[PDB]
Amino acid sequence: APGQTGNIADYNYKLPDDFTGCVIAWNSNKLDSKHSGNYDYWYRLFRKSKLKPFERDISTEIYQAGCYFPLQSYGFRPTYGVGHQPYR
Amino acid sequence: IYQTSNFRVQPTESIVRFPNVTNLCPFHEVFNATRFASVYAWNRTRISNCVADYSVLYNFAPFFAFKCYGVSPTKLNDLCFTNVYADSFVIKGNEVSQIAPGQTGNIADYNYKLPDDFTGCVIAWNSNKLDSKHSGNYDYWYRLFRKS
Amino acid sequence: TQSYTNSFTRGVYYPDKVFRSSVLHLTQDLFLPFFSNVTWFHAVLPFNDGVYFASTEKSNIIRGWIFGTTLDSKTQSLLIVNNATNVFIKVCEFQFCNDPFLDVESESGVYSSANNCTFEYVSQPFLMKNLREFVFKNIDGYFKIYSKHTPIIGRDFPQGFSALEPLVDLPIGINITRFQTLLALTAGAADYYVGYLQPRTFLLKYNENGTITDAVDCALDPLSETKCTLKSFTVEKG
Amino acid sequence: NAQALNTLVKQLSSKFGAISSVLNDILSRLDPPEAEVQIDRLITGRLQS
Amino acid sequence: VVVLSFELLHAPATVCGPKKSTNLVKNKCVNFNFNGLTGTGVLTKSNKKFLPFQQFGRDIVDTTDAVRDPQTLEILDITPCSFGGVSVITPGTNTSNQV
Ligand SMILES: *[C@@H]1O[C@H](CO)[C@@H](O[C@@H]2O[C@H](CO)[C@@H](O)[C@H](O)[C@H]2NC(C)=O)[C@H](O)[C@H]1NC(C)=O
Ligand SMILES: *[C@@H]1O[C@H](CO)[C@@H](O)[C@H](O)[C@H]1NC(C)=O
Ligand SMILES: *[C@@H]1O[C@H](CO)[C@@H](O)[C@H](O)[C@H]1NC(C)=O
Ligand SMILES: *[C@@H]1O[C@H](CO)[C@@H](O)[C@H](O)[C@H]1NC(C)=O
Ligand SMILES: *[C@@H]1O[C@H](CO)[C@@H](O)[C@H](O)[C@H]1NC(C)=O
Ligand SMILES: *[C@@H]1O[C@H](CO)[C@@H](O)[C@H](O)[C@H]1NC(C)=O
Ligand SMILES: *[C@@H]1O[C@H](CO)[C@@H](O)[C@H](O)[C@H]1NC(C)=O
């Protein structure tokens, strides 16, 4: 949401403060979650820093401390709701 | 004669002044100390007011694990949380999938139970060379079974 | 002896940490109103919102304080003592429930069940023909203590003006309701006073060197109220 | 003419209903959309002066 | 393995991180941050007397005009950087273009 900051709020998807669209939630936990973890697709947890609104970065593993990829797995479940929901 | 705008003299630089940095945190006590308490009887390391420099942490005994579950490693020295709740112990390397929110097992419900709502940094490294000498410390005890 | 006496023009402390010169600043904070009752104790009390200790004698009168809520069990109490070398502003409590000793040699006779001590602040000893004053104000977990070291010239109240300067502020975070006094530094006497603090509006006067030299109580008499409105010490005919 | 200028200058230290009376003090320790409404109170107050 | 939990309470914070510092300059328009006090101006050596518990001075209209350096205890003056209006003197543009 516009304004609030922390972790993936601005590390990856920085929503501009002049937002005008509408946010919609589509939860199909069974469909988009493996029983042991959706390791196929990963989220960038610990990158360099924040980024300006509507900026996409695809380079990975180049940065290292001065850690490799910061993709800290998924561990999802089709029935788990808290911490494992796909939440597209 | 007309008036159009106003003129200003821009600053040339920026300056910052702050008092002498004293009263370092007790983190130096665990330094030059290659042994501490156990996992069940973990040693209390409550920290009072002090300067929270953490650069020396990354230098002594390079930590294999640096990730912070609650905060970010970049957002480490900026915070001024009220106090510190630091708990340390010795664990098996093969038990890596035991120190985290979840993964309840041998060390969770029998030994000290790690809280799920962690708001700190998870640091772990193999200190066999610094701790496990040739003689070894097999006499040390850790719970593999319990009833509570 | 629970006698009473006039408080006169006493109990002014520096309100903040701001330098001022040749200005008349009108503040609004906790103060001791002029000409109030003072319970001249000679031989247990609510904390209210501050106190005004004035125990003077000449050289040795008071040597301790308690400043607790329950004064026993394990509830934190901001015990304060002092001697020739250092003070002990520490959050550490005994059981008390007794009269502490009046020796003229160690902490024995006062402590019974000294438990864990959380805070152990130590600083310059309080002591600097001596008059000692005090203000114990707490707000947002900030224990603020003031002091003054004017010599005593009159056995009664030495009518005049004084300004208490800050001594130390601590981030304790506890609430207190009662307190006790420890004395004797053996037949003798121990002069001892106490007042109370109320919200007030005052008009202080600063000289060009930044020292408070006068004040006016804005709710005392019709003349004093007029001065606060005009922000001056002289009122013309009108 | 001297009183009006002094009164005008002293209006710069009035909260007018915001957290503080300093522009950049509330700029730092506040949420960027939350700080938007605080600046609104100061601007409206200072325009009225 | 050591885990440090960053708890917090309404009581005032105790463990703050390390704080940096810089040099000092005089007779130059520069931004300053003196122990959490922010502002801009020219800092020059003062000649006023401070009681050893105050930090900064204020004038009649409640604007900062003196500060104390937290590194070395010394009193500095603060003067705002110069500003003013600007006028343009022109003849008729139907006559000339000089201003
Ligand atoms: C001394 O240590 C005791 C524990 O050994 C402290 O008591 C705990 O205090 C915390 C915070 O004040 C509470 O959350 C706990 O519930 C207390 N436990 C018990 C068993 O009392 C005590 O606060 C410490 N300090 C002092 C001055 O006693
Ligand atoms: C802080 O450090 C400087 C370094 O030169 C020193 O001169 C100064 O005295 C120190 N501060 C105090 C209060 O001593
Ligand atoms: C610090 O560790 C070194 C390691 O060789 C040791 O020689 C030294 O005595 C230690 N200092 C202490 C424990 O104060
Ligand atoms: C626990 O920590 C304290 C403080 O450093 C230390 O004195 C004590 O020896 C430690 N206990 C053990 C068992 O390591
Ligand atoms: C002080 O004495 C009593 C307090 O017991 C109080 O009622 C009285 O109004 C005060 N003033 C005088 C002159 O007694
Ligand atoms: C004052 O009390 C302290 C308590 O630590 C003690 O060390 C000191 O000797 C005392 N002063 C004198 C003059 O005995
Ligand atoms: C202020 O201090 C100066 C210099 O110490 C002194 O000359 C002057 O008399 C003082 N003003 C007073 C004491 O009112």
PDB file of C-alpha atoms in Angstrom, chain B residues 97-98 100-109 113:
ATOM      1  CA  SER B  97      16.416 -27.321  10.616  1.00  0.00           C
ATOM      2  CA  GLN B  98      15.594 -26.760  14.293  1.00  0.00           C
ATOM      3  CA  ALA B 100      13.498 -21.233  13.347  1.00  0.00           C
ATOM      4  CA  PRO B 101       9.791 -20.443  13.804  1.00  0.00           C
ATOM      5  CA  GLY B 102       8.354 -23.921  13.420  1.00  0.00           C
ATOM      6  CA  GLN B 103      10.227 -27.155  12.746  1.00  0.00           C
ATOM      7  CA  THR B 104       9.346 -28.382  16.231  1.00  0.00           C
ATOM      8  CA  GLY B 105      11.466 -31.370  17.181  1.00  0.00           C
ATOM      9  CA  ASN B 106      14.251 -32.630  19.427  1.00  0.00           C
ATOM     10  CA  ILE B 107      15.393 -29.226  20.714  1.00  0.00           C
ATOM     11  CA  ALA B 108      12.028 -27.430  20.630  1.00  0.00           C
ATOM     12  CA  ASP B 109       9.630 -29.260  22.964  1.00  0.00           C
ATOM     13  CA  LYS B 113      11.851 -23.760  22.957  1.00  0.00           C
TER      14      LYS B 113
END
